[PDB]
Design a protein around this nucleic acid. Structure first.
Ligand SMILES: [Mg+2]
Ligand SMILES: [Mg+2]
Ligand SMILES: [Mg+2]
Ligand SMILES: [Mg+2]
Ligand SMILES: [Mg+2]
Ligand SMILES: [Mg+2]
Ligand SMILES: [Mg+2]
Ligand SMILES: [Mg+2]
Ligand SMILES: [Mg+2]
Ligand SMILES: [Mg+2]
Ligand SMILES: [Mg+2]
Ligand SMILES: [Mg+2]
Ligand SMILES: [Mg+2]
Ligand SMILES: [Mg+2]
Ligand SMILES: [Mg+2]
Ligand SMILES: [Mg+2]
Ligand SMILES: [Mg+2]
Ligand SMILES: [Zn+2]
Lengths: 84, 115, 60, 177
RNA sequence: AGGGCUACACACGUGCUACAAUGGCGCAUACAAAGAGAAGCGACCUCGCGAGAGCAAGCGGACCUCAUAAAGUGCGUCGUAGUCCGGAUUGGAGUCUGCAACUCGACUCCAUGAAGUCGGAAUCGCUAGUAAUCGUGGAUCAGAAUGCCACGGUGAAUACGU
RNA sequence: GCGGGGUGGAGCAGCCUGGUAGCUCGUCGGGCUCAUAACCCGAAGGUCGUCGGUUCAAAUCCGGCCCCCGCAACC
RNA sequence: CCUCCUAAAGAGUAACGGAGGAGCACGAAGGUUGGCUAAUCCUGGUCGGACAUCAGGAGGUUAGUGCAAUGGCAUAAGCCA
């Protein structure tokens, strides 16, 4: 993982969008591309759309996901099992 | 003989015997026998009950078999329910740390299920 | 009770680590020594996450 | 006679004030403890029932009654008259002396004990439980554990409800969760 | 910009690690060859269990660093067990590279300890400093070797004959 | 009317005497050959035509029936 | 040869009428004395599940009877010694 000495990564556009969305309540989904953003304690309650290559996922942020990256909640590969 | 609610082999050394309280390997074994001052080479056949309960006190300073089992299952349940990539990867009984799944990855997948 | 079939039932000393020394009858024939007891157990006396560790490890 | 005198000296008085019963006769008693063992894998191993019963005597201090199949069953491959288990009925002094050890020595030695369930009163206050390993009792020589067998404990009582049975059983320090 | 070439019922080639005792683990201890380095090799010293961190010398190098060679040796134990074998997988806590380790990085520590107990049909390589085994370095390259390329140490077996 | 048999994809042993499913060819996986066939090594596939009854238990026994069938039908 | 129906409330009563069984078993499965009471489900229970054994409730013969059916059977003729 990212070494602690640097602090948790976050993308500027993501952070400023959640910021001015924080101060304005739970508005529309904040369609994001930065699947590499780490989740922050203030996003609890946010619904943010994340990219899987072609789509955006309606991912409601809970307390329990804090600390992890955003991209772990939008599967990029679609596999419904072999020989279906 | 009875350490952390379980039994340890009476015919083995101390280092080796303590490798059976699920949650302590060799390093923690040397650490117990340092914090308690028993030579690593002695077989617990040759202890006294007081040495044995001192062994119990020094192991009591960690998360062990019941603690470790259920706390681990709690972490994997957090993963299960998070729906994160590790969530899907444990729901799937697939590998979870990005190893190749075109080839063997069999420790997870088990034996072969030919088509 | 019938004779000739039941085990030998007599009283030995179940010694615990805590200083809990109780007399029971038992089919062991020899003394007991215990690691846990009704008054030295974790449960019998009361010995029995992401924002938190975040703030513990990540300062902004 | 330890926990029996504990009943006659503390528990009758506690439950005479909890429920304010008319007389002592209305206070629940612990009337028998039944220890059973299903040894159904003894279809081809008759030595198995007569070894797993050799442990129930050591646990109980008392020779058990080999129990037989009531009916024919092609499901689990048995026949009426085939003995597929063993039980002991404990009463009086030896019941109390078994019960006290069950409290003080036996349940402490269970792998990952988290508190006995309170969901095992059958509507009339009687408590059964499982013991998934015969080495929580020390009378077994752990060096001659020739198999890992369990047993059901059943504790019957004059308690009339689940509530009264969990109460009577709670003036006796049963570790409910 | 993100995602994919890193998927996954399966089948195949190519190698690695083992299944142990001619070996594993603790201790000390010996003899290489070759080769790289300036947006670099980076010692001493201090700090962290460790990967590494800090500050800070030398070197465009038969001078400085890379960089303690492992096998081996001796001492102790293990005493044939799914084991003081095996190290997959998995959880937690980590370091570092680069904007950036979710998909999808490389190493650390702790915990876990899976198959595996010498491999069906078949099939490959080698006639000597060879196979076999044991470590070393280089190119690529911010990081990312069980591959390739290159280097030594030990060191065999057997060849009637066609 | 009397009397048969039905069992993995195909063809048949297993039944009489209730337990303890087989052979041969086929299918799939891998070998061998330049490739195919032959040849070699593994493996998977039937709880027995529907079903009632009796039973400890049914492919086996009985029968309502179902398919395929054979001998009888005369003065 | 046995049981039931036809068979018309005593007995008996036919048809190539409607339905089933027997050609045994048991030295205990006979005698006697003492004792005992089923099916089924429900709740709780280590394994263990629709279904094993344990414990308790509901239920009251829906069980059981060495083998058909009918009549009987608790004072049991059923179950154990
Ligand atoms: Mg990878
Ligand atoms: Mg590719
Ligand atoms: Mg050079
Ligand atoms: Mg390099
Ligand atoms: Mg190992
Ligand atoms: Mg480790
Ligand atoms: Mg194995
Ligand atoms: Mg072995
Ligand atoms: Mg090498
Ligand atoms: Mg690199
Ligand atoms: Mg004519
Ligand atoms: Mg008449
Ligand atoms: Mg008349
Ligand atoms: Mg007449
Ligand atoms: Mg007839
Ligand atoms: Mg009588
Ligand atoms: Mg009689
Ligand atoms: Zn105690």
């Amino acid at each position: 993982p990212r070494s602690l000495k640097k602090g948790p990564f976050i993308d500027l556009h993501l952070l400023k969008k959640v910021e001015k969305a924080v101060e304005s309540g739970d508005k529309k989904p904040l369609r994001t591309w930065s699947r590499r953003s780490t989740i922050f304690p203030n996003m609890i309650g946010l619904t943010i759309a994340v990219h899987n290559g072609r789509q955006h996922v309606p991912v409601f942020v809970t307390d329990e996901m804090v600390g992890h990256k955003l991209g772990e909640f939008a599967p990029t590969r679609t596999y419904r099992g072999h020989a279906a | 003989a009875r350490i952390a609610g379980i039994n340890i082999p009476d015919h083995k050394h101390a280092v080796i015997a303590l490798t059976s309280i699920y949650g302590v390997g060799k390093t923690r074994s040397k650490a117990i026998l340092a914090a308690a001052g028993i030579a690593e080479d002695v077989k617990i056949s040759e202890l006294s009950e007081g040495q044995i309960d001192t062994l119990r006190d020094e192991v009591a300073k960690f998360v062990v078999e019941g603690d470790l089992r259920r706390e681990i299952s709690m972490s994997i349940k957090r993963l299960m329910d998070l729906g994160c990539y590790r969530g899907l990867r444990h729901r799937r009984g697939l590998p979870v740390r990005g190893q190749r799944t075109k080839t063997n990855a069999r420790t997870r997948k088990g034996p072969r299920k030919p088509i | 009770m019938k004779k000739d079939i039941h085990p030998k039932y007599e009283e030995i000393t179940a010694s615990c680590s805590c200083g809990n020394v109780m007399k029971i009858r038992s089919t062991v024939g020899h003394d007991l020594n215990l690691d846990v007891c009704s008054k030295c157990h974790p449960f019998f006396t009361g010995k029995q996450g992401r924002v938190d560790r975040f703030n513990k490890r990540f300062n902004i | 006679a330890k926990l029996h005198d504990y009943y006659k000296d503390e528990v009758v008085k506690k439950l005479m004030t909890e429920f304010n019963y008319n007389s002592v006769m209305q206070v629940p008693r612990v009337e028998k403890i039944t220890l059973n063992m299903g040894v159904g894998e003894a279809i081809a191993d008759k030595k198995l029932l007569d070894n797993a019963a050799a442990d129930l005597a050591a646990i109980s201090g008392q020779k058990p009654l080999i129990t037989k199949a009531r009916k024919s069953v092609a499901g689990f491959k048995i026949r009426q008259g085939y003995p597929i288990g063993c039980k002991v009925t404990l009463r009086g002094e030896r019941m109390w002396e078994f019960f006290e050890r069950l409290i003080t020595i036996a349940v402490p030695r269970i792998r990952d004990f988290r508190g006995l369930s309170a969901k095992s009163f059958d509507g009339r206050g009687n408590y059964s439980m499982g013991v998934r390993e015969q080495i929580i009792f020390p009378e077994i020589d752990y060096d001659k554990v020739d198999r890992v067998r369990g047993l059901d404990i059943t504790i019957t009582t004059t308690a009339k409800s689940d509530e009264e049975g969990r109460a009577l059983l709670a003036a006796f320090d049963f570790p409910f969760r």
